[PDB]
Curated annotation (Swiss-Prot), chains A, B, C:
GO terms for molecular function: identical protein binding; peptidase activity; serine-type endopeptidase activity. DegQ can reversibly switch between different oligomeric forms that represent inactive (6-mer) and active (12- and 24-mer) protease states. Substrate binding triggers the conversion of the resting DegQ trimer and hexamer into catalytically active 12- and 24-mers. The conversion of 6-mer (DegQ6) into 12-mer (DegQ12) or 24-mer (DegQ24) is crucial in regulating protease activity. It comes from Escherichia coli (strain K12). The active site is at H48, D78, S153. The chain holds residues 38 to 361 of 455 of the full protein. It comes from the Bacteria. Its EC number is 3.4.21.107. Its main location: periplasm. This is Periplasmic pH-dependent serine endoprotease DegQ. It is found in: Periplasm. It is an enzyme of class 3 (hydrolase). Optimum pH is 5.5. The degradation is efficient at pH values between 4.5 and 6.
Length: 300, 300, 300
């Protein structure tokens, strides 16, 4: 009868694992992970967690320990995929559409802070599409005020249905501890990158064939436009998908697949996460007139 | 169907702005503000955000940038009022009655910590009428556990209806980051001070004409009284509104306009923030007997 | 109409007090407490709050001050019991069954951080049965993300009904400030220890007569077992209750009174907090076969 997160945490907590690492001088590292495929034993984590690893072990919240092998990783986005050796009676997580997230939505962080064991912390979605934090090469972070500390890395950011909305990755902390400014790689980005690693053992980096800057209020005022966020195209590379689709220098990319862009940095991370050959719909503004253009991504 | 703060934040987030400051060797400061009047472009902020500013710019959550001029400020309470130069299509905030607040009420803190952009954080109202923190000259702070960090100053403390309950001002933090002890100037105090600055370009400090100390459990025990918080009057200045009203040395001021006082410091801050000439009702206690006295405020 | 914690905190906050201590060069210390018996003026707190006290005073949230005397304390579990001298019109707390708690349940911390005055902070139950933190001799901590800081210790951890679920005791903080990793002694442990101090002025430490290590996934794999958390028995002391009940070396204690054990350390703290002479039911596993064994506790 009393409101609680316990009925949904009960079912979902076994999917979030502790990731123990050993490697090169000898060292012992600790982070978290999320079981994305119970049958194959596929675990999502951060690349900075398994980076110098020679031996990787996974621990379930029931005490069961398993060995794990690195399937693949991406240095730029900070996502690594592991495979549990001889998986058995595993629980997997359901993945939500992180593009349907909004500031104010409730979030639960599940990880292993300070190697204490499985810890759940609660908060809200503080911000979305966060970039220019110079944490990662590719950033499109969910920001949350759920307490996220060292050892929370690779862990789950969940909604109130216990579905994955993101992979806890970094924090802003003056003194090494949580102040309520935490960052998660969104679920759609982690899911897509995970698929590339299950299919090829490596990521396939997509590119538009565009060169540009951040759209500003200053460009918008100069051309009497009602949008001030997005990508300002300065150059369209010849022979690229963008040239073939009819993208022109001076265009303002406003949307990607119908969803508005809050920055060029968001566009850059969303396109590099997408596989070459994939077709995307670009929302454009040419001399103050709207256009929709379908672009086939090239390889980087 | 899932509970969320997103439906109310969607409407109210455009009203909370980022305040960028440049001044003197040159410096670049960052804080927050709240649009209190969309038509006139009136932005509430903290005085310490604006203190040494030569250039003030406001940024909306849609990316629009505006110039701003200082209308007026109060050093003692830490409130400043700005006016956006050439305001257009602005959203203003609804202001709630902060005197109707209670410990355990839900609060949403909105601002720009570490210059990240608009960030929303969640908590409860932890305490009310907080004084003697030696932060400000006049204090009557709302205490919240919503994550408040450097850059949140002048930002919004909202209720679940998205109404302003306070202006985020200070924090208690051993290591420069949030530990869940944040302070906000209450909306009633901020609203009144803002009116004085729109009307006169300066504040009008009111006074009772009373000299006193804090009421204690010790005074209460000595005189067999059942109240231990409020103001113990030691002197009534002749010719003052308190003298004329019949306030007498030895009286114990228990209430202000029917609302109980938790301290003399609260009385001091509430009276100073009230305009001279205003009539106030004083809940009093002489020789253990209750009295109500109407006092016309003088100037300080 | 708006959802809030205020309706339930209104009735319950008076039960949580501020504990002021004076001792030896003279010092002034500050912590919190909980009124467990309004008639007798029994206040539960932390031993570490009262440790060097020569004078103890209690302050209610209405401003009333009382003197207090130490009834008894336990160094190992960090529980102390005080008695208010000449109690009058006191509010007591209702105590909940902490064994019925689950990760995700909502919690409210009520204490006196940095000596500010009563403060309420909100969060969830992050983890349960936390041991091996080398904070206390006996640990079976509730972990919460409710902001707990210096001054909160000895204070209340409450559920949404305003019932005591634990006594805020310690935190994990890299820089001395809350990062959302707080620990409480569970209410069942605190209630039992408090009863022993009201009844005997001292605690009564129970023992099984067992020597063991932590059960691991390694032991479990070696003996083809489906449990990896508990106590691995290496030695049964002759003449002990365990010897008399047929506990043998090599047994794996899985449960205590039908409740699964997450560690040997949990078993240790639950047994030492139970009074000698009490009969306990031990969920056991010998040669991979389940057994229930009833053991009479000895004295330590």
């Amino acid at each position: 009868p009393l409101p609680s997160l316990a009925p949904m945490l009960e079912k979902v907590l076994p999917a979030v694992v502790s990731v123990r690492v050993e490697g090169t001088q000898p060292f012992e590292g600790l982070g978290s992970g999320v079981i994305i495929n119970a049958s194959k034993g596929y675990v999502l984590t951060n690349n900075h967690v398994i980076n110098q690893a020679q031996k990787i072990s996974i621990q379930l919240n029931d005490g069961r320990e398993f060995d794990a092998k690195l399937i693949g990783s991406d240095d730029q986005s900070d996502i690594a995929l592991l495979q549990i050796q001889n998986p058995s009676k595993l629980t997997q997580i359901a993945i939500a559409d992180s593009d349907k997230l909004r500031v104010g939505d409730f979030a639960v962080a599940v990880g292993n802070p300070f190697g204490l064991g499985q810890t759940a912390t609660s908060g809200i979605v503080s911000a979305l599409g966060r970039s220019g934090l110079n944490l990662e090469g590719l950033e499109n972070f969910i920001q949350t005020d759920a307490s996220i500390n060292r050892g929370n890395s690779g862990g789950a950011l969940l909604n109130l249905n216990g579905e994955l909305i993101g992979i806890n990755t970094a924090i802003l902390a003056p003194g090494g501890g949580s102040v309520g400014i935490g960052f998660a790689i969104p679920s759609n980005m982690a899911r897509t990158l995970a698929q590339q690693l299950i299919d090829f053992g490596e990521i396939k980096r997509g590119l538009l064939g565009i060169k540009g800057t951040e759209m500003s209020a200053d460009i918008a005022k100069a051309f009497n436009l009602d949008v001030q966020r997005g990508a300002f195209v300065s150059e369209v590379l010849p022979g690229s998908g963008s040239a073939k689709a009819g993208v022109k220098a001076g265009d303002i990319i406003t949307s990607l697949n119908g969803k508005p862009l809050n920055s060029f940095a968001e566009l850059r991370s969303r396109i590099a996460t997408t596989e070459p050959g994939t077709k995307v719909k670009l929302g454009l503004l040419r001399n103050g007139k709207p256009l929709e253009v379908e672009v086939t991504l090239d390889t980087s």
